[PDB]
Design a protein around this ligand. Sequence first.
Ligand SMILES: *[C@@H]1O[C@H](CO)[C@@H](O[C@@H]2O[C@H](CO)[C@@H](O)[C@H](O)[C@H]2NC(C)=O)[C@H](O[C@@H]2O[C@@H](C)[C@@H](O)[C@@H](O)[C@@H]2O)[C@H]1NC(C)=O
Ligand SMILES: *[C@@H]1O[C@H](CO)[C@@H](O)[C@H](O)[C@H]1NC(C)=O
Length: 826
Amino acid sequence: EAIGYGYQVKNAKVDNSTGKSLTALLQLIRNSPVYGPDIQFLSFTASFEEDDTLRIRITDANNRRWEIPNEVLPRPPPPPPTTTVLSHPHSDLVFTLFHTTPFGFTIYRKSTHDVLFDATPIPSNPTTFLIYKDQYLQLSSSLPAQQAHLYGLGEHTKPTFQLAHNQILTLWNADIASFNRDLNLYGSHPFYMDVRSSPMVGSTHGVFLLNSNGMDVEYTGDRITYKVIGGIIDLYIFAGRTPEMVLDQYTKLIGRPAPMPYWAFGFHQCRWGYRDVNEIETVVDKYAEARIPLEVMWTDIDYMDAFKDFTLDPVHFPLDKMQQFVTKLHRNGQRYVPILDPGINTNKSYGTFIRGMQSNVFIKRDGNPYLGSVWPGPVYYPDFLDPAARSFWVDEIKRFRDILPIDGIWIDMNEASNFITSAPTPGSTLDNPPYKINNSGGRVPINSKTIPATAMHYGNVTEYNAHNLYGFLESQATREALVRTSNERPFLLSRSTFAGSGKYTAHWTGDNAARWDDLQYSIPTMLNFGLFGMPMIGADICGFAESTTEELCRRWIQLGAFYPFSRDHSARDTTHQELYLWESVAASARTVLGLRYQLLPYYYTLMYDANLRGIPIARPLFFTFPDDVATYGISSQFLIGRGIMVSPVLQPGAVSVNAYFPRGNWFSLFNYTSSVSVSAGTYVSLSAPPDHINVHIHEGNIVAMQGEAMTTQAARSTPFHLLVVMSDHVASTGELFLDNGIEMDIGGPGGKWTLVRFFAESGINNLTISSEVVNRGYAMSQRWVMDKITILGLKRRVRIKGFVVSVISDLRQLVGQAFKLELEFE
Ligand SMILES: *[C@@H]1O[C@H](CO)[C@@H](O[C@@H]2O[C@H](CO)[C@@H](O)[C@H](O)[C@H]2NC(C)=O)[C@H](O[C@@H]2O[C@@H](C)[C@@H](O)[C@@H](O)[C@@H]2O)[C@H]1NC(C)=O
Ligand SMILES: *[C@@H]1O[C@H](CO)[C@@H](O)[C@H](O)[C@H]1NC(C)=O
């Protein structure tokens, strides 16, 4: 038989009133034995949530089906031949319903008529049809093959940021090592960005399927097809038209990226396998002696008593010694983060287990607590959809934190990971679904090495439907536990994630390997997570799995010192890879972390931007240069903020690197006399000696720097150096966000912040550098000082009343005080 026969439009109307909407009723043409029971009647709605966002919702007309709870991801509620057209006056998006047999729909741009999403079926081809079965949702759109450039649909390791043609991307949260290309990993993000090179270059939109079910997405270049194993179609189209606007629109829906504390941008050190407190103290001492900045010390499962949460190995990590250690860290302006797994060991003498059982907090199967296996052995999983489990979690964290101070939480293994696979429930189409997603690249059963689909959650909810939300839900609860036990802005690192997770947590690429391939892979992943609203992203520096090498680690710390989230972490069965162990690595580290720390106020500003507008910290070249199609395909370079570009060496033995430069003038942040000038965008073979990493700034930008220091605390009290890069084509601008570093609600009406804007422009005989201040209230309260300005991008020197570098010293200017500084040429 045919997979399905599709739907006809039974009726359709424009809802109207003050706010336009489109309601239709769809009817199944004919039933099919393949993939299970067809939903016979569908309710179809198209509606505008904002001017710039169109929502397509397709549900069973006669039965409520699974939807991501509004509590979990709050959002505006659903609305209450021949064609039916929907369009507002202030929207660029036009929706059309085609009463063909089977039916069709499209979304195009009012202005350019450029078709964004084209779900018109090819009558002879059911793979193009809308098919809607209880455990098989099929939705397909045609694409302009060469013109459509697609990004996202996480979480997968790929050598390219831009999605290659002709693949299947599987979304199903799984404990699969990120050193594996292509395979579905820890998180699921059913969002893609579609950048069009033509007809109007750089014109971008976003497409989001708000669905937590397992799915395959097939992308063949001229076509994209969702094949989903449950829930509903809840499809959102974001108008863009810039990439930054798409992410603004997307994060407006799924949640704005969480603020991060300033210290989170410090350098982080971890290792699986640190044997005792004395060892971690030694590591900290050795970082210090190496004059390598270290902000945060981390402890992996080693610290626990027999792999049990909320406990301390009484021999190797005794509480008194641990409290002394953390106290010393804090005294030195340093911080501490421990790991927590979700699995609660079933030990009878374990208080956490006892309290968990009392509050009935655990995920069940066939009416009994589901018995998983992880590091501690037999475990029970807290049901984070259960409010009682959330309280329990908060309470356990309170208890532990009362005894041992912590500064953040690392939540791991929260897919949820399971070292065993349970037997399927006989007869259950949930544990044995009619359509097999391409789990682990092998149509592996979904229940593989996780919690079975037939397991149950609060509100009679099946793991089948909720599985992809587990880590996300643990993140919510964990953040809340931190917020409820400290007034400081919290910090959370999560392995498993879902769309919206960024509102709560940072993420890292997981179990990567000490391989050159992986070094490179970190860049697309990093960029992807920006698109996913999770800008606080990074990869284990020098590689998690496998023993690293001096050269690899050296090149890794170089690159990694610019990850928003910068952590050295390693697996236990490997040679040690702390940065002080090789001299060449240490030297690189001091140089690159040096620059990172000088850039702290900038990264913090970028974090501010991210929370405000969803714009990622580490961004693609095409975010700043969308009109330059050469940048779409770049996967080995990236921007930090608007106009700084990092161009890493990603090959062994290489002492140069072939790097794309967009139009204009670019200046090395490591040596201002080094520059690159290209009249049109092109590759340049940059010199890249063993100790050197290429980092350049583009003309038209101002970045406010501060000084190097062993801690971020110390760094905040150093003088500001303003770096002004002049452009012949446009005024230079820049921005600096400052606050007390705890306001839970960043940049809020609470007002404990300032935004300083810088401006710079050349006259024919003079040069003006100036600043504007917002929230002078808070600004006038702060003792920040600018003592130096450096001016790049001019071919003549300037003074107070081939390229050259001008430097204005001894300024003694308060940052919080708006200034206008007049300079003249020589
Ligand atoms: C329940 O907790 C017990 C004490 O915390 C665990 O026993 C211990 O496990 C340690 C290794 O994880 C071992 O070095 C300790 O000496 C030992 N302590 C005692 C008092 O026996 C127990 O772990 C189980 O039994 C041990 C010996 C190993 O076989 C583990 O793999 C087992 O998990 C914990 N029970 C469970 C069910 O995990
Ligand atoms: C910096 O760059 C200049 C110009 O390319 C070069 O000649 C110089 O020796 C470099 N090193 C420095 C300033 O340490």
